[PDB]
Amino acid sequence: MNLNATILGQAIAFVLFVLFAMKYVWPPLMAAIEKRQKEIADGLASAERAHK
Amino acid sequence: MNLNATILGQAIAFVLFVLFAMKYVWPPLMAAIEKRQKEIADGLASAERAHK
Amino acid sequence: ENMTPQDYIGHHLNNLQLDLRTFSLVDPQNPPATFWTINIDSMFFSVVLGLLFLVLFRSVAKKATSGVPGKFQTAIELVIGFVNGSVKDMYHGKSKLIAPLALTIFVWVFLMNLMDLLPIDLLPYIAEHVLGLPALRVVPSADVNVTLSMALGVFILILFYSIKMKGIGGFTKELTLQPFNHWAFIPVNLILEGVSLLSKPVSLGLRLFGNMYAGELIFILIAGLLPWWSQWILNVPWAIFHILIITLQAFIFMVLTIVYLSMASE
Amino acid sequence: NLNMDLLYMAAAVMMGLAAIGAAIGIGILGGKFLEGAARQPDLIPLLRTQFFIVMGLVDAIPMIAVGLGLYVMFAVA
Amino acid sequence: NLNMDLLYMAAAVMMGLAAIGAAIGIGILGGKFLEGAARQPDLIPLLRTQFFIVMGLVDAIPMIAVGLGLYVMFAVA
Amino acid sequence: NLNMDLLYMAAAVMMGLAAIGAAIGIGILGGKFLEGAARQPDLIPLLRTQFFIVMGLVDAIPMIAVGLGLYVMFAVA
Amino acid sequence: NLNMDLLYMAAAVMMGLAAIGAAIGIGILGGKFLEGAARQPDLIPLLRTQFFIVMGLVDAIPMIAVGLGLYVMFAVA
Amino acid sequence: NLNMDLLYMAAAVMMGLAAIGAAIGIGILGGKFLEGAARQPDLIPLLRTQFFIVMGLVDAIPMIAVGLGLYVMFAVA
Amino acid sequence: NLNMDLLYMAAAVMMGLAAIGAAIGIGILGGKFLEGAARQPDLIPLLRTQFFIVMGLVDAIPMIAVGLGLYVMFAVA
Amino acid sequence: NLNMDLLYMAAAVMMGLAAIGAAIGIGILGGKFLEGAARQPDLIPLLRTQFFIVMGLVDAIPMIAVGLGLYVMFAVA
Amino acid sequence: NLNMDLLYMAAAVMMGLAAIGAAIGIGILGGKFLEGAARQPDLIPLLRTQFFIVMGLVDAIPMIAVGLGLYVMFAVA
Amino acid sequence: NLNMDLLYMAAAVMMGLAAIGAAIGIGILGGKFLEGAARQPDLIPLLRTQFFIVMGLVDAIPMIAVGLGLYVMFAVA
Amino acid sequence: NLNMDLLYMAAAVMMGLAAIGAAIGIGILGGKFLEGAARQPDLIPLLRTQFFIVMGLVDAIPMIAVGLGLYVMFAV
Amino acid sequence: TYHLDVVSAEQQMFSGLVEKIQVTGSEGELGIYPGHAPLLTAIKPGMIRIVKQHGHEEFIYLSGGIL
């Protein structure tokens, strides 16, 4: 339809949501999974030595 | 036209679509979340048991 | 109410522009000429859905537990795993930026597109009869401005990475030697690689825009051109089919962004 | 006025070309789907899943053309 | 006159292209169906069910083009 | 006068297209029929049944595309 | 001026399209027939029986077109 | 008058389309024939007989269109 | 004035051809994807990855065309 | 004067359709010949003989078309 | 005036043709890339390299066509 | 002035269809040549010549139309 | 006047049909090339030589057409 | 070069490294260079050309088999 300065404003609206995510959402959520995965892996290590 | 009749026509379709979703779309998502919760319960029960 | 259907369909295609110079609403009947006329509703539901997304994710990012997670945690970690798999498939660099960018794109576009499943007349009815606003359409993705905004973000990102990883020398090489490999062809190669580069973000934005614009436009027509006892039989199957489009057009924006960046760096 | 008949002509061409494209694309895709089903009859529903996924892509443009043709044919006229 | 004349040209092109699309698509689809059948005939009822599933998806848009050709001929006169 | 001398063109185009659609559609389908038969020639009567099952679907739209051509030639024109 | 020329044109499109369709459809069907022949050099008679059977269906509507193009150019014009 | 040229156009279309169709149908058929021949170099006379058999069925309608084009150019025009 | 006569036809040409191209291309590519899946499941995710990689390029020019069609049909006329 | 103008377009379309037909048909045939040649080099001369034998049938209808095209371009220029 | 409406129509035809060409060509190419991938995935990166190489060759002309379409549509207006 | 314009179109249509016929006709042909090459790298010197020997025939008519297209485009003006 | 618009039309037809021809021809050729290269991954360079050689013949008439189209659209 | 084994049900007929071979496959003559993609086919009775590393050609007669 019509180009509008809205195209510029949406660039402002966009970037911030990237940074707030990058800092305050993604790493904290990756840790939540990976720590549980580590616990299950060391569980397997214990299972190994348990019979060894 | 009467804008009244158009909204009355919209509501019917909207409710029908909502019911279709309720009985064909939401169930499998609850099933997937159930399955992931189930899997994590199994994994972590298996881990504490291995330590012991 | 003097609604000739062809004018009812006319109203629905009208955005609510804010004339910055007068800082005032641009009325539908006369459209002022200028580049300085923000589409208020489309940006408004853009930022509202983005805020809802980041709020609901902080509601877990700060409370998540590596135990047996809650039913609400399960869903967000599901989406996290899906996105992380998508990235770890097609990309192998170290840069931290890619994964959260993909997450934002996916969820934000999914919600914007999801807007279009709301009955067409609901919020436009409320917003003018309650709040007196003259025009309202409430699907953000259905406007060139938002989509080209996101795509021209991705474009700058492509340029940034394509420099950061192989510098101006390799970049001028790629812009000249491919495809034909002989220095004599470089005057042509400069153009063809140019278009093949510029097209990518344009193609992305226009794909999303066109799909959602047509999705909206079908609902408008169905509701404005049929009697009450018939609108359902065509509105229902369209919405059922449209679920798949609202999904795929977010997924593909995510995946193509990932691919363009991973290909620019690696 | 000379303004109107062109509209129905244009809508006709739009929807004709869209019908050709969508029908032939879906025929090709479905034919490969059916040969796959013949090879792996116990997998049929998974292949149906992938088939619907890809058909959602296929029908992207043809449904755009349908709407705009219909808009011209009724919303302009 | 001409206002009532070109309509037939438009409806003709519309339904002709719709016919080409439906015919070619269903032909490809049925050909693959027969290939699958001939390789393992006991499976014919299942493959036929899948074929009749896909066939409606093929026919979806051509038939709306056809309906609009009928409309242009009769209702727009 | 044009008001009828150009309706023939419309009827021509319509069933002209419908002819190639119906021809090739059966041409492709018939091809895979002969291919399967030659591999398992004793099975022809079963496959020949299925060929007729789908052949009616291929020509559904073309046939009405022929009728409306004639109807234009004789009912309006 | 606006009468006779255009009837030759309508017949021309009718028959050109019918020719494309008939030719290519029979070509496809014949190609499959010939590979069947090369694989079962004993069954040429049976395969050719079935080939003529189906070819009878292929060329129907193209002839429905050809005869009507003739009618146009020789009965009407 | 002007009309003396348009029949050239009608013949041009009616004949060029028959050229397209005849060339392509015969191409496909001969391709499958050469394949069968490369497999069965001891059978080429039988295969080539059958090839001419069905090639006569293919190129029939093209010849009708070509004859009509010749008639319209030389006899009528 | 005449602009809103002709430009709708322009848009219809643009979008119909874009629809043909995108639908046929995606049909072919998805067909090869499906026949790859049935040949070897446990690769479905990997082949789906590569399928989207390729599909991104198919749609480029068709999508540019669709965008410009919408632009002219709504921005200009 | 339009007789001096349209009759260039007449030969144009004749020659264009003839060109496409001949080129596509001979491409298909030559491809099926070449892929046999790669597989059965000891047959090369026999296959090439059969190839010219069949290609003589391809160019016939296209050659009718090109001769009349040149006739119109020069004789009744 | 009269110029602009035809300049838009010409851009439409040019870009629609460019779209069909690019789309179908890249689809034909991606099909072979995918079927090569399905038989031996470990070669995926080498095949993807070859594919992104040849895809530029196929993309050569269509991008010129669309560039000149834009030039006509906007720079000349 | 009048007479020039329409002949640039007739020049186009001749080279337009000649370009498609040649490019695709040779694309099909070259494809099988490369298939042969990959099966027998020891025969590339042999097949390369048989490619050319056949390549000359396919693009004969396109070369003609390109010539006469240039003629009308410059000589006939 | 009524003149120049039709010349742009002729050029557009030439160049669109050139796009169709060149793109589809190289698509077919490149598809067969990719499958051949997947078959014999050692001889990729030789097959690339063959591919470029025959691709030169593919694009000939399309390149002539593109040249004439640019001519007509600019030189007249 | 790649390693090649020609073996019968009874005895090993050939072994060692090779540069290339040419075989009359069931569906047409054929030639295997190194890195060739996995393939399986029957072969017709006749000679199989070997060129052993350093270009030493030789013909082995095979009464048929599977490659």
PDB file of N, CA and C in Angstrom, chain H:
ATOM      1  N   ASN H   1     -10.376  -4.572 -49.795  1.00  0.00           N
ATOM      2  CA  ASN H   1     -10.780  -4.539 -48.363  1.00  0.00           C
ATOM      3  C   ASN H   1      -9.643  -4.990 -47.455  1.00  0.00           C
ATOM      4  N   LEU H   2      -9.903  -4.945 -46.148  1.00  0.00           N
ATOM      5  CA  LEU H   2      -8.926  -5.386 -45.160  1.00  0.00           C
ATOM      6  C   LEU H   2      -8.972  -6.901 -44.984  1.00  0.00           C
ATOM      7  N   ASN H   3     -10.177  -7.476 -45.015  1.00  0.00           N
ATOM      8  CA  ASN H   3     -10.409  -8.863 -44.629  1.00  0.00           C
ATOM      9  C   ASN H   3      -9.458  -9.857 -45.286  1.00  0.00           C
ATOM     10  N   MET H   4      -8.850  -9.517 -46.423  1.00  0.00           N
ATOM     11  CA  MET H   4      -8.044 -10.494 -47.145  1.00  0.00           C
ATOM     12  C   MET H   4      -6.806 -10.934 -46.372  1.00  0.00           C
ATOM     13  N   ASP H   5      -6.446 -10.248 -45.288  1.00  0.00           N
ATOM     14  CA  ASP H   5      -5.262 -10.616 -44.523  1.00  0.00           C
ATOM     15  C   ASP H   5      -5.572 -11.555 -43.363  1.00  0.00           C
ATOM     16  N   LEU H   6      -6.718 -11.387 -42.704  1.00  0.00           N
ATOM     17  CA  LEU H   6      -6.951 -12.118 -41.462  1.00  0.00           C
ATOM     18  C   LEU H   6      -6.937 -13.620 -41.680  1.00  0.00           C
ATOM     19  N   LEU H   7      -7.403 -14.086 -42.836  1.00  0.00           N
ATOM     20  CA  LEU H   7      -7.389 -15.520 -43.079  1.00  0.00           C
ATOM     21  C   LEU H   7      -5.967 -16.059 -43.075  1.00  0.00           C
ATOM     22  N   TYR H   8      -4.994 -15.241 -43.479  1.00  0.00           N
ATOM     23  CA  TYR H   8      -3.606 -15.647 -43.303  1.00  0.00           C
ATOM     24  C   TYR H   8      -3.314 -15.924 -41.837  1.00  0.00           C
ATOM     25  N   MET H   9      -3.832 -15.086 -40.939  1.00  0.00           N
ATOM     26  CA  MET H   9      -3.586 -15.287 -39.517  1.00  0.00           C
ATOM     27  C   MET H   9      -4.262 -16.553 -39.016  1.00  0.00           C
ATOM     28  N   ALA H  10      -5.504 -16.785 -39.439  1.00  0.00           N
ATOM     29  CA  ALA H  10      -6.205 -17.980 -38.996  1.00  0.00           C
ATOM     30  C   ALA H  10      -5.464 -19.226 -39.441  1.00  0.00           C
ATOM     31  N   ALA H  11      -5.028 -19.255 -40.699  1.00  0.00           N
ATOM     32  CA  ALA H  11      -4.252 -20.395 -41.166  1.00  0.00           C
ATOM     33  C   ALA H  11      -2.943 -20.506 -40.403  1.00  0.00           C
ATOM     34  N   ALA H  12      -2.291 -19.373 -40.140  1.00  0.00           N
ATOM     35  CA  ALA H  12      -1.021 -19.403 -39.434  1.00  0.00           C
ATOM     36  C   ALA H  12      -1.166 -20.080 -38.084  1.00  0.00           C
ATOM     37  N   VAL H  13      -2.168 -19.681 -37.310  1.00  0.00           N
ATOM     38  CA  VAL H  13      -2.363 -20.291 -36.000  1.00  0.00           C
ATOM     39  C   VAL H  13      -2.748 -21.755 -36.157  1.00  0.00           C
ATOM     40  N   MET H  14      -3.756 -22.019 -36.991  1.00  0.00           N
ATOM     41  CA  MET H  14      -4.274 -23.372 -37.123  1.00  0.00           C
ATOM     42  C   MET H  14      -3.193 -24.343 -37.560  1.00  0.00           C
ATOM     43  N   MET H  15      -2.169 -23.853 -38.250  1.00  0.00           N
ATOM     44  CA  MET H  15      -1.122 -24.730 -38.742  1.00  0.00           C
ATOM     45  C   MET H  15       0.066 -24.802 -37.794  1.00  0.00           C
ATOM     46  N   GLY H  16       0.469 -23.674 -37.212  1.00  0.00           N
ATOM     47  CA  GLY H  16       1.565 -23.704 -36.263  1.00  0.00           C
ATOM     48  C   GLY H  16       1.254 -24.556 -35.051  1.00  0.00           C
ATOM     49  N   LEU H  17       0.008 -24.515 -34.581  1.00  0.00           N
ATOM     50  CA  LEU H  17      -0.336 -25.348 -33.435  1.00  0.00           C
ATOM     51  C   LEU H  17      -0.271 -26.827 -33.796  1.00  0.00           C
ATOM     52  N   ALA H  18      -0.712 -27.185 -35.000  1.00  0.00           N
ATOM     53  CA  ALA H  18      -0.589 -28.571 -35.425  1.00  0.00           C
ATOM     54  C   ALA H  18       0.869 -28.971 -35.557  1.00  0.00           C
ATOM     55  N   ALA H  19       1.727 -28.041 -35.972  1.00  0.00           N
ATOM     56  CA  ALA H  19       3.153 -28.335 -36.027  1.00  0.00           C
ATOM     57  C   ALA H  19       3.683 -28.653 -34.639  1.00  0.00           C
ATOM     58  N   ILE H  20       3.389 -27.780 -33.675  1.00  0.00           N
ATOM     59  CA  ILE H  20       3.799 -28.015 -32.291  1.00  0.00           C
ATOM     60  C   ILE H  20       3.390 -29.416 -31.862  1.00  0.00           C
ATOM     61  N   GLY H  21       2.097 -29.711 -31.983  1.00  0.00           N
ATOM     62  CA  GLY H  21       1.587 -30.955 -31.437  1.00  0.00           C
ATOM     63  C   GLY H  21       2.156 -32.176 -32.130  1.00  0.00           C
ATOM     64  N   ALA H  22       2.226 -32.146 -33.461  1.00  0.00           N
ATOM     65  CA  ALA H  22       2.747 -33.299 -34.178  1.00  0.00           C
ATOM     66  C   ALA H  22       4.205 -33.533 -33.829  1.00  0.00           C
ATOM     67  N   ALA H  23       5.013 -32.473 -33.843  1.00  0.00           N
ATOM     68  CA  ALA H  23       6.426 -32.646 -33.555  1.00  0.00           C
ATOM     69  C   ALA H  23       6.625 -33.206 -32.160  1.00  0.00           C
ATOM     70  N   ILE H  24       5.890 -32.695 -31.174  1.00  0.00           N
ATOM     71  CA  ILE H  24       6.158 -33.116 -29.804  1.00  0.00           C
ATOM     72  C   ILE H  24       5.648 -34.529 -29.551  1.00  0.00           C
ATOM     73  N   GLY H  25       4.453 -34.859 -30.040  1.00  0.00           N
ATOM     74  CA  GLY H  25       3.962 -36.209 -29.849  1.00  0.00           C
ATOM     75  C   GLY H  25       4.863 -37.231 -30.507  1.00  0.00           C
ATOM     76  N   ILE H  26       5.290 -36.955 -31.740  1.00  0.00           N
ATOM     77  CA  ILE H  26       6.168 -37.893 -32.417  1.00  0.00           C
ATOM     78  C   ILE H  26       7.510 -37.956 -31.709  1.00  0.00           C
ATOM     79  N   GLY H  27       7.968 -36.835 -31.157  1.00  0.00           N
ATOM     80  CA  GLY H  27       9.208 -36.860 -30.405  1.00  0.00           C
ATOM     81  C   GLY H  27       9.142 -37.809 -29.229  1.00  0.00           C
ATOM     82  N   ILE H  28       8.103 -37.677 -28.410  1.00  0.00           N
ATOM     83  CA  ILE H  28       7.967 -38.555 -27.251  1.00  0.00           C
ATOM     84  C   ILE H  28       7.913 -40.010 -27.697  1.00  0.00           C
ATOM     85  N   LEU H  29       7.075 -40.294 -28.695  1.00  0.00           N
ATOM     86  CA  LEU H  29       6.901 -41.676 -29.115  1.00  0.00           C
ATOM     87  C   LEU H  29       8.209 -42.255 -29.630  1.00  0.00           C
ATOM     88  N   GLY H  30       8.911 -41.508 -30.476  1.00  0.00           N
ATOM     89  CA  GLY H  30      10.168 -41.992 -31.003  1.00  0.00           C
ATOM     90  C   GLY H  30      11.226 -42.141 -29.935  1.00  0.00           C
ATOM     91  N   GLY H  31      11.196 -41.289 -28.913  1.00  0.00           N
ATOM     92  CA  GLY H  31      12.141 -41.448 -27.824  1.00  0.00           C
ATOM     93  C   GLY H  31      11.959 -42.770 -27.110  1.00  0.00           C
ATOM     94  N   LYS H  32      10.720 -43.075 -26.724  1.00  0.00           N
ATOM     95  CA  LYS H  32      10.497 -44.371 -26.091  1.00  0.00           C
ATOM     96  C   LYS H  32      10.820 -45.515 -27.041  1.00  0.00           C
ATOM     97  N   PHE H  33      10.612 -45.313 -28.341  1.00  0.00           N
ATOM     98  CA  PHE H  33      10.966 -46.348 -29.301  1.00  0.00           C
ATOM     99  C   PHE H  33      12.468 -46.585 -29.324  1.00  0.00           C
ATOM    100  N   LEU H  34      13.258 -45.513 -29.376  1.00  0.00           N
ATOM    101  CA  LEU H  34      14.706 -45.672 -29.394  1.00  0.00           C
ATOM    102  C   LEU H  34      15.208 -46.308 -28.113  1.00  0.00           C
ATOM    103  N   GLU H  35      14.591 -45.990 -26.978  1.00  0.00           N
ATOM    104  CA  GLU H  35      14.963 -46.682 -25.750  1.00  0.00           C
ATOM    105  C   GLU H  35      14.745 -48.183 -25.894  1.00  0.00           C
ATOM    106  N   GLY H  36      13.521 -48.576 -26.252  1.00  0.00           N
ATOM    107  CA  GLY H  36      13.246 -49.990 -26.436  1.00  0.00           C
ATOM    108  C   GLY H  36      14.200 -50.633 -27.423  1.00  0.00           C
ATOM    109  N   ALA H  37      14.569 -49.896 -28.470  1.00  0.00           N
ATOM    110  CA  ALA H  37      15.487 -50.428 -29.468  1.00  0.00           C
ATOM    111  C   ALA H  37      16.865 -50.664 -28.874  1.00  0.00           C
ATOM    112  N   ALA H  38      17.377 -49.692 -28.123  1.00  0.00           N
ATOM    113  CA  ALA H  38      18.680 -49.863 -27.502  1.00  0.00           C
ATOM    114  C   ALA H  38      18.684 -51.054 -26.563  1.00  0.00           C
ATOM    115  N   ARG H  39      17.538 -51.376 -25.965  1.00  0.00           N
ATOM    116  CA  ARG H  39      17.517 -52.555 -25.107  1.00  0.00           C
ATOM    117  C   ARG H  39      17.448 -53.849 -25.911  1.00  0.00           C
ATOM    118  N   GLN H  40      16.710 -53.861 -27.018  1.00  0.00           N
ATOM    119  CA  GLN H  40      16.384 -55.088 -27.743  1.00  0.00           C
ATOM    120  C   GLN H  40      16.811 -54.997 -29.203  1.00  0.00           C
ATOM    121  N   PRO H  41      18.113 -54.869 -29.470  1.00  0.00           N
ATOM    122  CA  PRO H  41      18.558 -54.657 -30.855  1.00  0.00           C
ATOM    123  C   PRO H  41      18.162 -55.774 -31.802  1.00  0.00           C
ATOM    124  N   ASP H  42      17.696 -56.908 -31.289  1.00  0.00           N
ATOM    125  CA  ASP H  42      17.225 -57.993 -32.137  1.00  0.00           C
ATOM    126  C   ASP H  42      15.767 -57.844 -32.539  1.00  0.00           C
ATOM    127  N   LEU H  43      15.048 -56.877 -31.975  1.00  0.00           N
ATOM    128  CA  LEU H  43      13.616 -56.749 -32.199  1.00  0.00           C
ATOM    129  C   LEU H  43      13.236 -55.516 -33.001  1.00  0.00           C
ATOM    130  N   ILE H  44      14.205 -54.720 -33.441  1.00  0.00           N
ATOM    131  CA  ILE H  44      13.904 -53.382 -33.942  1.00  0.00           C
ATOM    132  C   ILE H  44      12.863 -53.407 -35.057  1.00  0.00           C
ATOM    133  N   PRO H  45      12.792 -54.416 -35.934  1.00  0.00           N
ATOM    134  CA  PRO H  45      11.730 -54.361 -36.949  1.00  0.00           C
ATOM    135  C   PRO H  45      10.336 -54.487 -36.366  1.00  0.00           C
ATOM    136  N   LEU H  46      10.140 -55.340 -35.364  1.00  0.00           N
ATOM    137  CA  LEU H  46       8.829 -55.451 -34.734  1.00  0.00           C
ATOM    138  C   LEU H  46       8.451 -54.144 -34.049  1.00  0.00           C
ATOM    139  N   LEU H  47       9.353 -53.640 -33.207  1.00  0.00           N
ATOM    140  CA  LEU H  47       9.111 -52.387 -32.510  1.00  0.00           C
ATOM    141  C   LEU H  47       8.811 -51.272 -33.494  1.00  0.00           C
ATOM    142  N   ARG H  48       9.583 -51.194 -34.573  1.00  0.00           N
ATOM    143  CA  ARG H  48       9.421 -50.121 -35.541  1.00  0.00           C
ATOM    144  C   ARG H  48       8.115 -50.248 -36.310  1.00  0.00           C
ATOM    145  N   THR H  49       7.670 -51.474 -36.576  1.00  0.00           N
ATOM    146  CA  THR H  49       6.334 -51.663 -37.118  1.00  0.00           C
ATOM    147  C   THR H  49       5.304 -51.038 -36.190  1.00  0.00           C
ATOM    148  N   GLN H  50       5.267 -51.503 -34.941  1.00  0.00           N
ATOM    149  CA  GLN H  50       4.279 -50.982 -33.999  1.00  0.00           C
ATOM    150  C   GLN H  50       4.387 -49.467 -33.868  1.00  0.00           C
ATOM    151  N   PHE H  51       5.613 -48.949 -33.902  1.00  0.00           N
ATOM    152  CA  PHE H  51       5.822 -47.512 -33.840  1.00  0.00           C
ATOM    153  C   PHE H  51       5.077 -46.810 -34.960  1.00  0.00           C
ATOM    154  N   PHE H  52       5.255 -47.270 -36.201  1.00  0.00           N
ATOM    155  CA  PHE H  52       4.506 -46.649 -37.290  1.00  0.00           C
ATOM    156  C   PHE H  52       3.009 -46.806 -37.081  1.00  0.00           C
ATOM    157  N   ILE H  53       2.586 -47.953 -36.549  1.00  0.00           N
ATOM    158  CA  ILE H  53       1.165 -48.164 -36.292  1.00  0.00           C
ATOM    159  C   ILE H  53       0.612 -47.002 -35.488  1.00  0.00           C
ATOM    160  N   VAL H  54       1.218 -46.740 -34.331  1.00  0.00           N
ATOM    161  CA  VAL H  54       0.644 -45.733 -33.436  1.00  0.00           C
ATOM    162  C   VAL H  54       1.004 -44.321 -33.887  1.00  0.00           C
ATOM    163  N   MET H  55       2.102 -44.157 -34.623  1.00  0.00           N
ATOM    164  CA  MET H  55       2.442 -42.841 -35.145  1.00  0.00           C
ATOM    165  C   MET H  55       1.396 -42.365 -36.134  1.00  0.00           C
ATOM    166  N   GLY H  56       0.823 -43.293 -36.899  1.00  0.00           N
ATOM    167  CA  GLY H  56      -0.286 -42.930 -37.758  1.00  0.00           C
ATOM    168  C   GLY H  56      -1.489 -42.446 -36.977  1.00  0.00           C
ATOM    169  N   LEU H  57      -1.735 -43.032 -35.804  1.00  0.00           N
ATOM    170  CA  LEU H  57      -2.810 -42.532 -34.957  1.00  0.00           C
ATOM    171  C   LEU H  57      -2.481 -41.165 -34.390  1.00  0.00           C
ATOM    172  N   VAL H  58      -1.209 -40.912 -34.097  1.00  0.00           N
ATOM    173  CA  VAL H  58      -0.825 -39.620 -33.538  1.00  0.00           C
ATOM    174  C   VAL H  58      -1.029 -38.518 -34.565  1.00  0.00           C
ATOM    175  N   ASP H  59      -0.344 -38.615 -35.698  1.00  0.00           N
ATOM    176  CA  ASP H  59      -0.239 -37.456 -36.578  1.00  0.00           C
ATOM    177  C   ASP H  59      -1.484 -37.237 -37.428  1.00  0.00           C
ATOM    178  N   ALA H  60      -2.581 -37.936 -37.141  1.00  0.00           N
ATOM    179  CA  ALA H  60      -3.791 -37.782 -37.939  1.00  0.00           C
ATOM    180  C   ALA H  60      -4.347 -36.365 -37.836  1.00  0.00           C
ATOM    181  N   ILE H  61      -4.775 -35.967 -36.636  1.00  0.00           N
ATOM    182  CA  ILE H  61      -5.439 -34.668 -36.480  1.00  0.00           C
ATOM    183  C   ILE H  61      -4.554 -33.537 -36.975  1.00  0.00           C
ATOM    184  N   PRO H  62      -3.264 -33.482 -36.639  1.00  0.00           N
ATOM    185  CA  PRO H  62      -2.395 -32.463 -37.243  1.00  0.00           C
ATOM    186  C   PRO H  62      -2.589 -32.327 -38.739  1.00  0.00           C
ATOM    187  N   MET H  63      -2.757 -33.441 -39.450  1.00  0.00           N
ATOM    188  CA  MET H  63      -2.946 -33.351 -40.890  1.00  0.00           C
ATOM    189  C   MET H  63      -4.280 -32.712 -41.245  1.00  0.00           C
ATOM    190  N   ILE H  64      -5.330 -32.961 -40.463  1.00  0.00           N
ATOM    191  CA  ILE H  64      -6.594 -32.273 -40.709  1.00  0.00           C
ATOM    192  C   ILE H  64      -6.398 -30.773 -40.572  1.00  0.00           C
ATOM    193  N   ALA H  65      -5.738 -30.359 -39.490  1.00  0.00           N
ATOM    194  CA  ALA H  65      -5.512 -28.934 -39.287  1.00  0.00           C
ATOM    195  C   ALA H  65      -4.651 -28.343 -40.392  1.00  0.00           C
ATOM    196  N   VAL H  66      -3.643 -29.083 -40.845  1.00  0.00           N
ATOM    197  CA  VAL H  66      -2.764 -28.582 -41.894  1.00  0.00           C
ATOM    198  C   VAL H  66      -3.531 -28.428 -43.197  1.00  0.00           C
ATOM    199  N   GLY H  67      -4.363 -29.412 -43.529  1.00  0.00           N
ATOM    200  CA  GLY H  67      -5.167 -29.308 -44.731  1.00  0.00           C
ATOM    201  C   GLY H  67      -6.111 -28.126 -44.680  1.00  0.00           C
ATOM    202  N   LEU H  68      -6.741 -27.902 -43.528  1.00  0.00           N
ATOM    203  CA  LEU H  68      -7.634 -26.758 -43.419  1.00  0.00           C
ATOM    204  C   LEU H  68      -6.866 -25.450 -43.537  1.00  0.00           C
ATOM    205  N   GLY H  69      -5.665 -25.385 -42.967  1.00  0.00           N
ATOM    206  CA  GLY H  69      -4.870 -24.179 -43.111  1.00  0.00           C
ATOM    207  C   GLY H  69      -4.493 -23.920 -44.556  1.00  0.00           C
ATOM    208  N   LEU H  70      -4.108 -24.974 -45.273  1.00  0.00           N
ATOM    209  CA  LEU H  70      -3.795 -24.836 -46.689  1.00  0.00           C
ATOM    210  C   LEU H  70      -5.014 -24.361 -47.465  1.00  0.00           C
ATOM    211  N   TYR H  71      -6.168 -24.974 -47.205  1.00  0.00           N
ATOM    212  CA  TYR H  71      -7.393 -24.570 -47.879  1.00  0.00           C
ATOM    213  C   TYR H  71      -7.683 -23.097 -47.639  1.00  0.00           C
ATOM    214  N   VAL H  72      -7.609 -22.660 -46.386  1.00  0.00           N
ATOM    215  CA  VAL H  72      -7.969 -21.283 -46.082  1.00  0.00           C
ATOM    216  C   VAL H  72      -6.994 -20.315 -46.738  1.00  0.00           C
ATOM    217  N   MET H  73      -5.704 -20.649 -46.763  1.00  0.00           N
ATOM    218  CA  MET H  73      -4.753 -19.718 -47.364  1.00  0.00           C
ATOM    219  C   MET H  73      -4.911 -19.663 -48.877  1.00  0.00           C
ATOM    220  N   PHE H  74      -4.890 -20.821 -49.539  1.00  0.00           N
ATOM    221  CA  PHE H  74      -4.812 -20.844 -50.996  1.00  0.00           C
ATOM    222  C   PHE H  74      -6.179 -20.798 -51.664  1.00  0.00           C
ATOM    223  N   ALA H  75      -7.160 -21.516 -51.125  1.00  0.00           N
ATOM    224  CA  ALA H  75      -8.461 -21.613 -51.771  1.00  0.00           C
ATOM    225  C   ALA H  75      -9.372 -20.451 -51.393  1.00  0.00           C
ATOM    226  N   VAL H  76      -9.599 -20.243 -50.099  1.00  0.00           N
ATOM    227  CA  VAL H  76     -10.466 -19.152 -49.669  1.00  0.00           C
ATOM    228  C   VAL H  76      -9.766 -17.817 -49.861  1.00  0.00           C
ATOM    229  N   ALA H  77      -8.582 -17.674 -49.281  1.00  0.00           N
ATOM    230  CA  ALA H  77      -7.763 -16.493 -49.503  1.00  0.00           C
ATOM    231  C   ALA H  77      -6.949 -16.672 -50.779  1.00  0.00           C
TER     232      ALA H  77
END
